[PDB]
Write an enzyme that holds these catalytic residues in place. Structure first.
Site, PDB file in Angstrom:
ATOM      1  N   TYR A   1      24.121   3.494  21.868  1.00 31.70           N
ATOM      2  CA  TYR A   1      23.090   3.644  22.892  1.00 31.70           C
ATOM      3  C   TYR A   1      23.529   2.925  24.162  1.00 31.70           C
ATOM      4  CZ  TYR A   1      20.013   5.020  18.977  1.00 31.70           C
ATOM      5  OH  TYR A   1      19.474   5.627  17.867  1.00 31.70           O
TER       6      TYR A   1
ATOM      7  N   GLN B   1      14.604 -13.076  11.313  1.00 33.76           N
ATOM      8  CA  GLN B   1      15.801 -12.436  10.783  1.00 33.76           C
ATOM      9  C   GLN B   1      16.508 -11.465  11.724  1.00 33.76           C
ATOM     10  OE1 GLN B   1      16.818 -11.228   6.314  1.00 33.76           O
ATOM     11  NE2 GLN B   1      15.332  -9.788   7.179  1.00 33.76           N
TER      12      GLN B   1
ATOM     13  N   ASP C   1      -4.106  -2.189   0.936  1.00 37.35           N
ATOM     14  CA  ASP C   1      -3.847  -2.521   2.329  1.00 37.35           C
ATOM     15  C   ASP C   1      -4.305  -3.955   2.572  1.00 37.35           C
ATOM     16  OD1 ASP C   1      -4.746  -0.777   5.422  1.00 37.35           O
ATOM     17  OD2 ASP C   1      -3.772  -2.713   5.091  1.00 37.35           O
TER      18      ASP C   1
ATOM     19  N   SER D   1       9.489  -4.204  22.458  1.00 33.51           N
ATOM     20  CA  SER D   1       8.905  -3.044  21.792  1.00 33.51           C
ATOM     21  C   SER D   1       7.533  -3.485  21.297  1.00 33.51           C
ATOM     22  CB  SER D   1       9.782  -2.570  20.624  1.00 33.51           C
ATOM     23  OG  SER D   1       9.535  -3.309  19.442  1.00 33.51           O
TER      24      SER D   1
ATOM     25  N   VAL E   1       2.504   2.587   2.281  1.00 36.03           N
ATOM     26  CA  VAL E   1       2.364   3.423   3.469  1.00 36.03           C
ATOM     27  C   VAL E   1       3.721   3.806   4.062  1.00 36.03           C
ATOM     28  CG1 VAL E   1       2.284   1.597   5.209  1.00 36.03           C
ATOM     29  CG2 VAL E   1       1.053   3.753   5.591  1.00 36.03           C
TER      30      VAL E   1
ATOM     31  N   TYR F   1       6.444  -3.181  18.426  1.00 37.79           N
ATOM     32  CA  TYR F   1       6.645  -3.774  17.111  1.00 37.79           C
ATOM     33  C   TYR F   1       7.086  -5.233  17.303  1.00 37.79           C
ATOM     34  CZ  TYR F   1       9.822  -5.999  13.991  1.00 37.79           C
ATOM     35  OH  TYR F   1      10.429  -7.031  13.320  1.00 37.79           O
ATOM     36  N   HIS F   2       8.132  -5.444  18.099  1.00 39.85           N
ATOM     37  CA  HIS F   2       8.630  -6.796  18.323  1.00 39.85           C
ATOM     38  C   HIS F   2       7.526  -7.680  18.875  1.00 39.85           C
ATOM     39  CE1 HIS F   2      12.689  -4.838  18.210  1.00 39.85           C
ATOM     40  NE2 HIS F   2      12.980  -5.973  17.599  1.00 39.85           N
TER      41      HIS F   2
ATOM     42  N   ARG G   1       7.598  -2.258  10.620  1.00 41.91           N
ATOM     43  CA  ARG G   1       8.752  -2.922  11.220  1.00 41.91           C
ATOM     44  C   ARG G   1       9.679  -2.157  12.148  1.00 41.91           C
ATOM     45  NH1 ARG G   1      13.832  -0.627  10.332  1.00 41.91           N
ATOM     46  NH2 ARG G   1      14.158  -0.066   8.129  1.00 41.91           N
TER      47      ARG G   1
ATOM     48  N   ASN H   1       0.834  -1.191   0.000  1.00 45.30           N
ATOM     49  CA  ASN H   1       0.000   0.000   0.000  1.00 45.30           C
ATOM     50  C   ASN H   1       0.876   1.252   0.000  1.00 45.30           C
ATOM     51  OD1 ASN H   1       0.917  -0.094   2.657  1.00 45.30           O
ATOM     52  ND2 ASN H   1      -1.084   0.392   3.574  1.00 45.30           N
TER      53      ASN H   1
HETATM   54  N1  LIG Z   1      15.217  -3.761   7.929  1.00 44.58           N
HETATM   55  C1  LIG Z   1      15.835  -4.675   8.676  1.00 44.58           C
HETATM   56  O1  LIG Z   1      16.914  -4.481   9.227  1.00 44.58           O
HETATM   57  C2  LIG Z   1      15.067  -5.953   8.993  1.00 44.58           C
HETATM   58  C3  LIG Z   1      15.628  -6.893   9.895  1.00 44.58           C
HETATM   59  C4  LIG Z   1      14.993  -8.115  10.192  1.00 44.58           C
HETATM   60  C5  LIG Z   1      13.698  -8.344   9.710  1.00 44.58           C
HETATM   61  N2  LIG Z   1      13.108  -7.412   8.824  1.00 44.58           N
HETATM   62  C6  LIG Z   1      11.675  -7.670   8.544  1.00 44.58           C
HETATM   63  O2  LIG Z   1      11.369  -7.652   7.136  1.00 44.58           O
HETATM   64  C7  LIG Z   1      10.056  -7.091   6.910  1.00 44.58           C
HETATM   65  C8  LIG Z   1      10.191  -5.887   5.976  1.00 44.58           C
HETATM   66  O3  LIG Z   1      11.195  -4.972   6.463  1.00 44.58           O
HETATM   67  P1  LIG Z   1      11.764  -3.725   5.657  1.00 44.58           P
HETATM   68  O4  LIG Z   1      12.956  -3.213   6.368  1.00 44.58           O
HETATM   69  O5  LIG Z   1      11.806  -4.050   4.211  1.00 44.58           O
HETATM   70  O6  LIG Z   1      10.568  -2.704   5.890  1.00 44.58           O
HETATM   71  P2  LIG Z   1       9.972  -1.553   4.968  1.00 44.58           P
HETATM   72  O7  LIG Z   1       9.210  -0.611   5.826  1.00 44.58           O
HETATM   73  O8  LIG Z   1      11.060  -1.024   4.096  1.00 44.58           O
HETATM   74  O9  LIG Z   1       9.006  -2.426   4.031  1.00 44.58           O
HETATM   75  C9  LIG Z   1       7.697  -2.830   4.475  1.00 44.58           C
HETATM   76  C10 LIG Z   1       6.757  -2.636   3.302  1.00 44.58           C
HETATM   77  O10 LIG Z   1       5.476  -3.170   3.682  1.00 44.58           O
HETATM   78  C11 LIG Z   1       4.463  -2.248   3.276  1.00 44.58           C
HETATM   79  N3  LIG Z   1       3.278  -2.435   4.148  1.00 44.58           N
HETATM   80  C12 LIG Z   1       3.162  -2.192   5.473  1.00 44.58           C
HETATM   81  N4  LIG Z   1       1.917  -2.400   5.905  1.00 44.58           N
HETATM   82  C13 LIG Z   1       1.267  -2.788   4.811  1.00 44.58           C
HETATM   83  C14 LIG Z   1      -0.096  -3.137   4.694  1.00 44.58           C
HETATM   84  N5  LIG Z   1      -0.978  -2.985   5.685  1.00 44.58           N
HETATM   85  N6  LIG Z   1      -0.526  -3.554   3.467  1.00 44.58           N
HETATM   86  C15 LIG Z   1       0.295  -3.634   2.395  1.00 44.58           C
HETATM   87  N7  LIG Z   1       1.595  -3.289   2.505  1.00 44.58           N
HETATM   88  C16 LIG Z   1       2.101  -2.858   3.698  1.00 44.58           C
HETATM   89  C17 LIG Z   1       5.117  -0.876   3.367  1.00 44.58           C
HETATM   90  O11 LIG Z   1       4.443   0.118   2.582  1.00 44.58           O
HETATM   91  C18 LIG Z   1       6.537  -1.185   2.905  1.00 44.58           C
HETATM   92  O12 LIG Z   1       6.775  -0.972   1.506  1.00 44.58           O
HETATM   93  C19 LIG Z   1       9.500  -6.789   8.304  1.00 44.58           C
HETATM   94  O13 LIG Z   1       8.734  -7.874   8.829  1.00 44.58           O
HETATM   95  C20 LIG Z   1      10.750  -6.634   9.155  1.00 44.58           C
HETATM   96  O14 LIG Z   1      10.563  -6.689  10.571  1.00 44.58           O
HETATM   97  C21 LIG Z   1      13.804  -6.224   8.439  1.00 44.58           C
HETATM   98  O1  LIG Z   2      22.264   4.100  16.326  1.00 42.00           O
HETATM   99  C1  LIG Z   2      21.993   3.075  16.938  1.00 42.00           C
HETATM  100  C2  LIG Z   2      20.914   2.161  16.590  1.00 42.00           C
HETATM  101  C3  LIG Z   2      20.671   1.078  17.368  1.00 42.00           C
HETATM  102  N1  LIG Z   2      21.410   0.781  18.502  1.00 42.00           N
HETATM  103  C4  LIG Z   2      21.137  -0.462  19.262  1.00 42.00           C
HETATM  104  O2  LIG Z   2      21.441  -1.612  18.441  1.00 42.00           O
HETATM  105  C5  LIG Z   2      20.465  -2.653  18.645  1.00 42.00           C
HETATM  106  C6  LIG Z   2      19.733  -2.989  17.338  1.00 42.00           C
HETATM  107  O3  LIG Z   2      18.849  -1.919  16.976  1.00 42.00           O
HETATM  108  P1  LIG Z   2      18.343  -1.591  15.513  1.00 42.00           P
HETATM  109  O4  LIG Z   2      19.449  -1.744  14.547  1.00 42.00           O
HETATM  110  O5  LIG Z   2      17.585  -0.330  15.578  1.00 42.00           O
HETATM  111  O6  LIG Z   2      17.319  -2.790  15.304  1.00 42.00           O
HETATM  112  P2  LIG Z   2      15.943  -3.291  15.970  1.00 42.00           P
HETATM  113  O7  LIG Z   2      15.255  -2.141  16.591  1.00 42.00           O
HETATM  114  O8  LIG Z   2      16.188  -4.528  16.741  1.00 42.00           O
HETATM  115  O9  LIG Z   2      15.070  -3.588  14.653  1.00 42.00           O
HETATM  116  C7  LIG Z   2      15.514  -4.005  13.398  1.00 42.00           C
HETATM  117  O10 LIG Z   2      16.065  -5.323  13.459  1.00 42.00           O
HETATM  118  C8  LIG Z   2      15.136  -6.290  13.996  1.00 42.00           C
HETATM  119  C9  LIG Z   2      15.871  -7.609  14.090  1.00 42.00           C
HETATM  120  O11 LIG Z   2      15.078  -8.577  14.752  1.00 42.00           O
HETATM  121  C10 LIG Z   2      13.870  -6.359  13.127  1.00 42.00           C
HETATM  122  O12 LIG Z   2      12.931  -7.249  13.718  1.00 42.00           O
HETATM  123  C11 LIG Z   2      13.253  -4.965  12.980  1.00 42.00           C
HETATM  124  O13 LIG Z   2      12.150  -5.013  12.086  1.00 42.00           O
HETATM  125  C12 LIG Z   2      14.311  -3.980  12.461  1.00 42.00           C
HETATM  126  O14 LIG Z   2      13.777  -2.666  12.421  1.00 42.00           O
HETATM  127  C13 LIG Z   2      19.603  -2.160  19.800  1.00 42.00           C
HETATM  128  O15 LIG Z   2      20.116  -2.697  21.020  1.00 42.00           O
HETATM  129  C14 LIG Z   2      19.703  -0.638  19.760  1.00 42.00           C
HETATM  130  O16 LIG Z   2      19.356   0.026  20.975  1.00 42.00           O
HETATM  131  C15 LIG Z   2      22.475   1.611  18.910  1.00 42.00           C
HETATM  132  O17 LIG Z   2      23.161   1.445  19.924  1.00 42.00           O
HETATM  133  N2  LIG Z   2      22.702   2.721  18.092  1.00 42.00           N
END
Ligand SMILES: NC(=O)c1ccc[n+]([C@@H]2O[C@H](COP(=O)([O-])OP(=O)(O)OC[C@H]3O[C@@H](n4cnc5c(N)ncnc54)[C@H](O)[C@@H]3O)[C@@H](O)[C@H]2O)c1
Ligand SMILES: O=c1ccn([C@@H]2O[C@H](COP(=O)(O)OP(=O)(O)O[C@H]3O[C@H](CO)[C@@H](O)[C@H](O)[C@H]3O)[C@@H](O)[C@H]2O)c(=O)[nH]1
Ligand SMILES: NC(=O)c1ccc[n+]([C@@H]2O[C@H](COP(=O)([O-])OP(=O)(O)OC[C@H]3O[C@@H](n4cnc5c(N)ncnc54)[C@H](O)[C@@H]3O)[C@@H](O)[C@H]2O)c1
Ligand SMILES: O=c1ccn([C@@H]2O[C@H](COP(=O)(O)OP(=O)(O)O[C@H]3O[C@H](CO)[C@@H](O)[C@H](O)[C@H]3O)[C@@H](O)[C@H]2O)c(=O)[nH]1
Lengths: 390, 390
Positions: free
Chosen positions: A255, A208, A74, A179, A34, A181-182, A100, A32
């Site tokens: 942090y 992941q 959505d 959190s 968003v 989210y988590h 996320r 979507n």
């Molecule tokens: N970014 C990382 O470091 C990381 C780490 C581990 C796991 N992941 C996981 O991978 C997934 C995607 O992460 P990302 O970093 O690509 O996030 P992102 O925000 O870049 O991508 C998420 C996408 O989902 C779409 N979306 C959200 N709600 C929606 C809804 N209601 N309907 C349709 N589309 C929707 C958003 O518009 C967006 O394009 C998440 O579950 C996240 O927790 C990411």
């Molecule tokens: O500038 C920074 C950013 C983060 N942290 C710390 O590093 C760790 C990891 O944080 P971050 O990289 O922000 O990741 P998460 O908040 O754990 O979330 C990301 O990584 C998760 C891995 O499980 C995914 O589930 C989430 O969607 C994704 O946003 C935490 O202890 C933070 O407090 C720092 O000390 N300094």
């Protein structure tokens, strides 16, 4: 095989969609967009400019001739999700479509509620669509390593065999998210596990670790295919953030004590792992859980690595201790198991000098686009309120 | 002490509200009365006719002079919840206000989604209201014994000390819910646990067993104070259902093998236990978990007890094996710990001949009001669909 990539315009999703298409799967993106609205609403922006989802898909087609179908909507809207499912008829669904960001989920009540509703209900809709329109469709769900928290024992891949009071059983691994989210991911996982048993759904929960990097073979084929690289304190993550900070001369934002340890993986391994999960599906009624990461790093360790890498580029990287906005252990035991994906053939791209050099140089060349006002965190886990923040 | 009873027009809530008022707490009821709408929508009805919430409260005041404040609204509407909280200023909040029927949560997609959204978001709103308007307010939450499922090991009261790979830790007890309703409670518990650690919220999760009975000292003081007694296959529960079945001459509906074992407790102990939890509050940042039940019974055991009790009333009770509409273990190990409430002074009303005789006679005298069409279950765990059912 036909794959529906929910959240395909996102960071992990876009890279994955392109990779699967290249690997010859029929692919569609359900999103979507968003996440893009969030950028506008919070005043955030990717380090690198990205093309519209339409131009992204159009470019891929122009270059390779392959067409990635697009369904904009959505997934919490079942009518839209149902129509997309029936129209595309996926053999696999990869669910990246959720809010996320941990910080985002802690901004205020409305955002915490939005995070849990959007994530939990959207996932329920996906399970019902699979059950109703394609029960054999394999669900590859993105959970999170954050579901396990930081216990004083080894973290297993989803399950643990316990002997209690003379009896033994293998039970779901205790969850301790830190959190909203988590937590939503923990809810997702429990919901999915139930449907596997009750309906025979086949699913793979990919817990992941934190992803780093911006380049993948496919996204580098043209500027319009470029992925996003977030560095702000809301959507940016540890390593990516540090690299951008080093490039702009901002001290690395550690942090608290910096002992926070987590699993990490190159975005290139993200797409590889998802493909492996799709190619080797879960069986009917099976709820597989893979801990998806390649290496464990503490924040302090990442700080040292980026500093050393930055030195080779004469960046004179500095570090700073930021009062932790989050509630979490800043020193803890951490030994998370991760062998399931390796057993299925994963060929990891371990963090290297070459990767850091590439990512740092990338940040340096786009340093002019970095909004330093977004580097420091302004979202408190404890001070979170009910008034919708602007 | 001031107590806000969310869901106070309900089965457990009404009995509890009256009891607390009698025990001299200042009490208010927060309820949107949606449960009554469900009765109308599904064609259900309590065995005994009940008075309107307004007439119920008016009668209590007429008899005792005590006034129970009433706030009619949906707790998912934060504006309403916030106003009620600020207006009443509770010292304790007892949360009974959730969609509690397992069958209801399995009717179709819309009802499964409604169950999880209503329950999870409503509870999040409660946590945010406490944090924002009265952080010292003690949350007494109704979880569910169903959160633990039926593992091959003893079930503890919320936590378990595990020794894994040479290391020890006390972690949250693994959860395995078997319905979208039971799952929503697991989500609630995880959410609350987090806020206790992050915000210092003090809460007590009451994982209650199946409740039986209709009379409590307060509700029996006048017909208009009478509680509801559900016997239909959607909101009715095992023992209460069997007693009504015996009274109308319907064979006892044993689902599957009948080995399903659960904890049970008299409604009189429900109000007692909640009062004990309120009188002996959790400390700041503490997430207490009590397994709230007094005895364990298998469905087959309940069948035998009701048959024996029915014999004394010449009811010639018969039993029947109904193909199980649910997905659950019909034969399993079950040893759930329950000592925390006993340690705090609980004086249990163990199931007795006297209780069964009273409840059976009660059902017999209102047998003319029993809609036998609602006795047999028509909601399948496996056949659940997306079309909203009528
Ligand atoms: N970014 C990382 O470091 C990381 C780490 C581990 C796991 N992941 C996981 O991978 C997934 C995607 O992460 P990302 O970093 O690509 O996030 P992102 O925000 O870049 O991508 C998420 C996408 O989902 C779409 N979306 C959200 N709600 C929606 C809804 N209601 N309907 C349709 N589309 C929707 C958003 O518009 C967006 O394009 C998440 O579950 C996240 O927790 C990411
Ligand atoms: O500038 C920074 C950013 C983060 N942290 C710390 O590093 C760790 C990891 O944080 P971050 O990289 O922000 O990741 P998460 O908040 O754990 O979330 C990301 O990584 C998760 C891995 O499980 C995914 O589930 C989430 O969607 C994704 O946003 C935490 O202890 C933070 O407090 C720092 O000390 N300094
Ligand atoms: N009935 C039992 O056998 C039993 C057993 C163990 C635990 N419990 C638990 O006790 C609690 C109450 O159970 P009950 O049997 O009294 O249920 P009930 O349906 O009789 O009462 C619930 C009440 O909450 C209200 N409510 C629901 N959603 C609301 C919302 N969004 N806003 C405001 N009010 C709302 C309903 O209108 C209703 O009056 C539940 O958590 C349940 O799981 C009941
Ligand atoms: O006529 C019947 C009714 C139920 N059962 C079985 O008995 C057990 C208990 O079922 P029931 O009495 O319907 O209770 P639950 O569905 O477990 O739910 C009730 O008891 C739970 C206790 O944790 C609460 O959480 C819920 O809110 C409340 O609705 C289950 O194995 C049923 O399949 C039968 O065999 N025959």
């Amino acid at each position: 095989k036909r794959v529906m990539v929910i959240g395909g315009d996102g960071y992990c999703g876009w890279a994955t969609a392109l990779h699967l298409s290249k690997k010859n799967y029929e692919v569609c993106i359900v999103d979507n967009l968003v996440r893009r609205l969030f950028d506008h609403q919070l005043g955030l922006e990717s380090l690198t400019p990205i093309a519209s989802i339409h131009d992204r898909i159009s470019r891929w087609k122009a270059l390779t001739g392959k067409s990635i179908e697009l369904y904009v909507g959505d997934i919490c809207d079942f009518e839209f999700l149902a129509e997309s499912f029936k129209s595309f008829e996926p053999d696999s669904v990869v669910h990246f479509g959720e809010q996320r960001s941990a910080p985002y989920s802690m901004i205020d009540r409305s955002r915490a509620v939005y995070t849990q509703h959007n994530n939990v209900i959207g996932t329920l809709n996906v399970l019902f669509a699979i059950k109703e329109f394609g029960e054999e469709c394999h669900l590859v769900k993105l959970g999170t390593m954050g579901e396990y928290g930081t216990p004083n024992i080894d973290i297993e891949e989803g399950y643990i065999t316990i002997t209690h009071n003379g009896r033994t059983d293998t039970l779901p691994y205790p969850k301790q998210a830190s959190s909203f989210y988590h937590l939503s991911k923990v809810h997702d996982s429990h919901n999915i596990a139930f449907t596997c048993k009750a309906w025979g759904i086949r699913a793979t929960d990919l817990n992941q670790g934190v992803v780093y990097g911006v380049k993948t073979d496919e996204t580098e084929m043209h500027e319009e295919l470029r992925n996003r690289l977030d560095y702000d304190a809301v959507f940016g993550t540890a390593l990516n953030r540090f690299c951008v900070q080093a490039a702009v001369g901002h001290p690395l934002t550690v942090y608290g004590k910096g002992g926070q340890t987590r699993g990490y993986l190159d975005i290139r391994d993200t797409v590889q792992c998802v493909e492996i999960a799709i190619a080797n599906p879960a069986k009917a009624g099976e709820f597989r859980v893979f801990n998806q990461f390649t290496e464990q790093f503490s924040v302090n360790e990442l700080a040292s690595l980026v500093t050393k890498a930055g030195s080779k580029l004469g960046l004179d990287v500095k570090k700073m201790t930021v009062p932790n906005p989050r509630v979490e252990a800043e020193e803890h035991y951490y030994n998370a198991k991760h062998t399931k994906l390796m057993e299925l053939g994963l060929e990891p791209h371990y963090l290297s000098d070459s990767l850091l050099d590439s990512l740092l140089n990338f940040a340096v060349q786009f340093k002019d686009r970095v909004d330093t006002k977004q580097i420091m965190p302004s979202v408190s886990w404890k001070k979170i309120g009910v008034k919708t923040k602007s």
